[PDB]
Design a protein around this ligand. Structure first.
Ligand SMILES: Nc1ncnc2[nH]cnc12
Length: 247
C-alpha cells in the first residue's frame, strides 16, 4: 500500500509519494530506461491501494489497476464506490470486500464522461495540493453533484502524475496555492496510450515512431514528435502502457 498525508505536506513529500506509487507498479522490462507495465496480472496481484488523508484527518482508500494505472474506485468508511465499467466490476471481486455498502457511480472513469457529468472541462478545474484536499473531502462526504469534478482532481493528482514527470512537478509545486492546468498537461494526458505504443514500436524501428504524436508544448505550440530523442521521451514520460493493454 502507498500513503500520502496532506497535513504538513511539502513539494518534497508529494514527490516521495509519486515515487512510491511508480515503485508499486510491476514492470516486465524497461524500454529506453522507462518501465514497461505488465499486460496481464491475476486479480490477486492486479490492484494496489493508495491511502489519502486530507487536512482534517479524513481518509479515503483508492484502488488502482497496476497494469494501466487506472482508478477503479474508492472507499470512505463503510461504503465503497466503483465506476460503471467492466474493469471496475472485476475489481470489486478483489478490493474493499468488507465494505458494508457498495455504490456503483452513474458513469465510467474516462474523461469525456467525467467532464459531461461535472459540467466542466479539465482546463477549468483547479489542481494543486489544496485542490486534492478538497477532492478528498468531497469524496469522503459523497456529494453526487460534486463527485465527478473531485474524481478528475484525484485522477490527475495520482495516475497522471505517476505517468509524467512534468505533471508530478507542476502539481507538487502548488502546496498552498491552486492553478489551472495548461494545454501542455491536457495533451500529455490525452496522448499517453499513443506515445506508449510508438515507443514500443520505436525499439524495433531504430528509435523512430511509425506514426507521429502531436503534443502541445509550454508555449501552446502543436509540436510533432517522431522519435525517442525527443524531450517528452528522454526526460518526461515515466511509465509505458503495454501494447497489449490498449484494446
Ligand atoms: N479513471 C482513470 N484513472 C486513471 N487514469 C485515467 N484517465 C482517464 N480516466 C482515468
Amino acid at each position: 500500500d502507498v500513503s500520502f498525508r496532506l497535513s504538513g505536506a511539502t513539494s518534497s513529500s508529494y514527490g516521495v509519494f509519486i515515487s512510491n506509487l511508480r515503485k508499486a507498479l510491476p514492470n516486465e522490462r524497461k524500454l529506453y530506461d522507462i518501465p514497461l507495465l505488465r499486460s496481464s496480472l491475476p486479480g490477486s496481484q492486479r490492484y494496489a491501494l493508495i491511502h489519502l488523508t486530507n487536512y482534517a484527518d479524513e481518509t479515503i482508500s483508492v484502488a488502482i489497476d497496476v497494469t494501466n494505472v487506472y482508478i477503479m474506485g474508492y472507499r470512505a468508511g463503510d461504503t465503497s464506490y466503483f465506476f460503471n465499467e467492466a474493469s471496475a466490476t472485476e475489481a470489486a471481486k478483489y478490493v474493499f470486500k468488507d465494505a458494508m455498502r457498495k455504490v456503483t457511480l452513474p458513469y465510467s472513469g474516462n474523461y469525456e464522461r467525467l467532464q459531461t457529468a461535472a459540467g466542466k472541462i479539465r482546463e477549468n478545474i483547479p489542481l494543486g495540493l489544496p485542490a486534492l484536499d478538497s477532492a478528498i473531502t468531497t469524496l469522503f462526504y459523497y456529494n453526487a453533484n460534486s463527485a465527478a469534478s473531485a474524481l478528475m482532481v484525484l485522477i490527475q493528482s495520482t495516475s497522471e502524475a505517476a505517468r509524467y514527470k512534468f505533471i508530478e512537478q507542476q502539481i507538487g509545486k502548488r502546496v498552498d496555492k491552486t492553478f489551472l492546468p495548461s494545454l501542455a498537461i491536457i495533451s500529455l494526458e490525452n496522448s499517453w496510450s499513443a506515445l506508449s505504443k510508438q515507443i514500443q514500436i520505436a525499439s524495433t524501428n531504430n528509435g523512430q515512431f511509425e506514426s507521429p504524436v502531436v503534443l502541445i508544448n509550454a508555449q501552446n505550440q502543436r509540436v510533432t514528435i517522431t522519435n525517442v530523442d525527443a524531450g517528452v521521451v528522454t526526460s518526461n514520460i515515466a511509465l509505458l502502457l503495454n501494447r497489449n493493454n490498449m484494446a
